[PDB]
Write a protein that binds this ligand. Sequence first.
Ligand SMILES: CCCCCCCCO[C@@H]1O[C@H](CO)[C@@H](O)[C@H](O)[C@H]1O
Ligand SMILES: CCCCCCCCO[C@@H]1O[C@H](CO)[C@@H](O)[C@H](O)[C@H]1O
Ligand SMILES: CCCCCCCCO[C@@H]1O[C@H](CO)[C@@H](O)[C@H](O)[C@H]1O
Ligand SMILES: CCCCCCCCO[C@@H]1O[C@H](CO)[C@@H](O)[C@H](O)[C@H]1O
Lengths: 296, 296
Amino acid sequence: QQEKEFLESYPQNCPPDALPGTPGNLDSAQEKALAELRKLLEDAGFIERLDDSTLLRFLRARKFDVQLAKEMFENCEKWRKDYGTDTILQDFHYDEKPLIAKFYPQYYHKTDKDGRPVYFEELGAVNLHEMNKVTSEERMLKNLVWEYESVVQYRLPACSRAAGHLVETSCTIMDLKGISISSAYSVMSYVREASYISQNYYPERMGKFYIINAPFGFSTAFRLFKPFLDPVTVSKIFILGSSYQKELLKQIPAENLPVKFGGKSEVDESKGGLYLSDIGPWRDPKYIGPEGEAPE
Amino acid sequence: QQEKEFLESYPQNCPPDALPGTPGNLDSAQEKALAELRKLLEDAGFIERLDDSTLLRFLRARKFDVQLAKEMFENCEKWRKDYGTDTILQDFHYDEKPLIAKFYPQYYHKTDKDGRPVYFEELGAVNLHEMNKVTSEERMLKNLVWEYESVVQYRLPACSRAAGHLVETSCTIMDLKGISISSAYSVMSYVREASYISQNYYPERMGKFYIINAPFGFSTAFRLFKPFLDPVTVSKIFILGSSYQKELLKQIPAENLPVKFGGKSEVDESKGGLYLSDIGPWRDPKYIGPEGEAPE
Ligand SMILES: CCCCCCCCO[C@@H]1O[C@H](CO)[C@@H](O)[C@H](O)[C@H]1O
Ligand SMILES: CCCCCCCCO[C@@H]1O[C@H](CO)[C@@H](O)[C@H](O)[C@H]1O
Ligand SMILES: CCCCCCCCO[C@@H]1O[C@H](CO)[C@@H](O)[C@H](O)[C@H]1O
Ligand SMILES: CCCCCCCCO[C@@H]1O[C@H](CO)[C@@H](O)[C@H](O)[C@H]1O
């Protein structure tokens, strides 16, 4: 009575108007696709992470090819064992965070109108040189997986309860204000590594993606490739310039969005404002289940 | 005996390994799609431009929806009547060309390895201010349609004969060396207008598209959207930086590519080198048919 107990402690059906193939909306032969991936994995010795939400995201990332879903699934299970992800919430301590946070922000803050936790990344402010004095790329990546594990174990279940429906994804906002060719080159390895970790071991976890303060050449390229990108990806990716407030306020309440991005949400500066904060439904006693409160 | 005489004066079958749906390769039910669009248009009063190559390009631009092909076809026929395209080769004289060519290059020069005429556009060198003294956007657009009409009436048929196979498309090379946000804004209207004229009244005329000397932010965006653009479009579009020679020499011979782009082709400077030139198979007496030599 632990995983089963956890799964039924929060809503498990995505909203009715959600993309097909998502939990509670799968019907078009995909039910049979789901009820096949579970059989193969049960025989292969696997016991955990076989819930509807999990396998469905694996089936969704691989167009519902039950064969490729097993591959992607085993390969991810291989990775969690090697990397020690299963014990990352209690093994790893990013005690350098207060020291380096200002050079590469990274922080979660409340939710958007769909219940998704909002993740902010001020990539344009990054200062790797000043960061390499304290930490290392390896540790920053451990922090990335540590936060991903907080999202699934604590944040998502709490958000589901607060929104009345599932919520398997997050809403991310990346700020490019301040990027240069120089710093862009200095972060490529971390970005390429972080990209590998999520769309392979955390697929379908992205629900919406916003890039604000994107430079002209960059923003222009998107405006020309729009008609050639699949409609499924243009529904999630948003590339906007210096005028982004109206768009953001259209997805995130206003009382939920930080004042710096055109909203009303203010974090007390006498306890690490925004950068060192982690406030949202997951810190509200009435939305915390049998898994207890997430770490800090 | 004029259009019929013209059509059989040059090869009419695309190479065997070409994209399906192209003349001489259409089979998969598309033959019936072709032999339907012609019937509807014959009843609608249309007499010209009903050859396999034409209608097939219209069917290809609209995924083979015979219904939308008729719409796109009539709408283009409407446009040629209004604009006076049918008589553009003899009505319009871009006598300002020698004066303004240096501010917005534009020139055709020989062919690539597939027989396609190569079109060069040094957009990054554009100087609209210096150009507005002499011409106007309206005239530049008339020149664009005048050149398009030389491509189909003279250039393509000559290239077909020289390559031994059809050739319905052109190979374009756009140079961004020298662009600014400023000049990018100063040319948006011409580019937006020119884009409207080709993919609506000259569809499937683009076979390959190369953008060289693309700025970093711009080039980067393409490298991230690559996996999301359809494989049909990534086969035609190439976005490269300052190192483009190897790629170009891989598509265009070397004796065909101008020295400035990393090749061996040199045009005599005592008669308008490149900018004011128009040399290729269409100026070779042995590749000119009953349509005679193209104008200058
Ligand atoms: C200039 C900005 C470049 C940003 C490139 C993406 C860097 C990380 O962005 C992440 O990429 C993941 C891919 O694994 C997605 O699944 C996540 O939703 C996204 O937040
Ligand atoms: C900045 C470039 C775009 C953001 C990174 C790639 C976007 C999505 O990457 C992947 O796309 C899949 C779609 O098949 C989704 O299932 C996953 O959520 C996501 O990991
Ligand atoms: C920064 C460079 C922006 C270039 C945008 C494209 C401008 C013209 O490019 C033309 O566009 C046509 C679309 O109608 C295509 O059919 C042609 O093949 C292409 O040459
Ligand atoms: C710089 C942005 C890309 C170049 C402009 C758009 C590229 C192609 O535009 C159109 O694509 C069609 C494909 O359905 C082809 O049939 C046509 O040749 C082309 O007009």
